Ligand binder design. Sequence first.
Ligand SMILES: O=P(O)(O)O[C@H]1[C@H](OP(=O)(O)O)[C@@H](OP(=O)(O)O)[C@H](OP(=O)(O)O)[C@@H](OP(=O)(O)O)[C@H]1OP(=O)(O)O
Ligand SMILES: [Cl-]
Ligand SMILES: [Cl-]
Ligand code: NA
Ligand code: NA
Ligand code: NA
Ligand code: NA
Length: 337
Amino acid sequence: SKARVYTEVNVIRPKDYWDYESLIVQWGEQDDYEVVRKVGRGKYSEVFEGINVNSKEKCIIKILKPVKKKKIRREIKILQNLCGGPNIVKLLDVVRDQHSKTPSLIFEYVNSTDFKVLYPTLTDYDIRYYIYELLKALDFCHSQGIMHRDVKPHNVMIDHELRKLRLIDWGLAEFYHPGKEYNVRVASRYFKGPELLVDLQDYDYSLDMWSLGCMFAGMIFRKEPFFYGHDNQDQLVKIAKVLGTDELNAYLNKYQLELDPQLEALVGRHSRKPWSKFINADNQHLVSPEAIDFLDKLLRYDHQDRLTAKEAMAHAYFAQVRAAETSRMRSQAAALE
Ligand SMILES: O=P(O)(O)O[C@H]1[C@H](OP(=O)(O)O)[C@@H](OP(=O)(O)O)[C@H](OP(=O)(O)O)[C@@H](OP(=O)(O)O)[C@H]1OP(=O)(O)O
Ligand SMILES: [Cl-]
Ligand SMILES: [Cl-]
Ligand code: NA
Ligand code: NA
Ligand code: NA
Ligand code: NA
């Protein structure tokens, strides 16, 4: 298997671009940034709100807990390659405790609510807008040869007042090289794609589109998580109880995969359920025909058959969002002129 798009990015660009393990980190002055208060509760790192000592502009400080030195360089290299991209969190500096070399990542300040806490309050239209803005980030990083591999509500930070969205936490992100077999121990359980659950290791950018589909389903159907598995095996069961096992078997047969008998026993056999099954009077206002067609084209076993980020942005579901952005920019230009 090879990606349908952006296949050759890392063949066109030089070794220095994707060879993170050889990264030369020009660290900054740790003294330039002062921590203010803790925030994050994670096992990979600790997050603090901070300030630049001089400019006094706020910032986010992410101290990377003990991890393979290679995981530190991977996250920094990816953040550097994506720096400046649409809706990518902006890495401003990297410093380290100059006696233990414990790295800290300095990001732009993110005055945001978490997607998980925000979307229950959002209108149909604002869900389209923020999904669209998230697609902009994913198309950009895919176009730069990078898979995020941990798309989920916690990693989407939104300042709803300013309508700004940022895709954060690039600690699991990886460079896409065609033909390469990757570790499947990525993404969070509820957002893991079937490829991870059946051990299809030569996956690609389309993994992120499955995860986006899971988020989207949970939002428009007001069911969080949409696929609520109790472990990685049950996660595939929960998917198969919606998408059906015929399409699963066709997918396994196409990529010459076999499930362990223990897992096949749990999956059993299940009919495909129509997306309308999840519509109720309480989520009806979020589930248009266009939403279902869009969702149906994301949540497919076959990663090759899912929409790319670019194709997703072009779906009719975002027709009004696209018209708003076209109009906004044309007006901004005239105001400047
Ligand atoms: O089988 P192990 O002895 O545990 O080695 C593995 C394995 O490396 P090999 O391919 O050399 O067997 C993983 O490689 P991939 O599955 O990614 O090809 C690698 O994956 P990551 O480095 O991406 O995590 C993983 O690393 P981790 O230590 O995080 O499990 C690493 O383990 P070691 O570095 O300890 O050998
Ligand atoms: Cl999933
Ligand atoms: Cl894709
Ligand atoms: Na900021
Ligand atoms: Na925030
Ligand atoms: Na797949
Ligand atoms: Na309703």
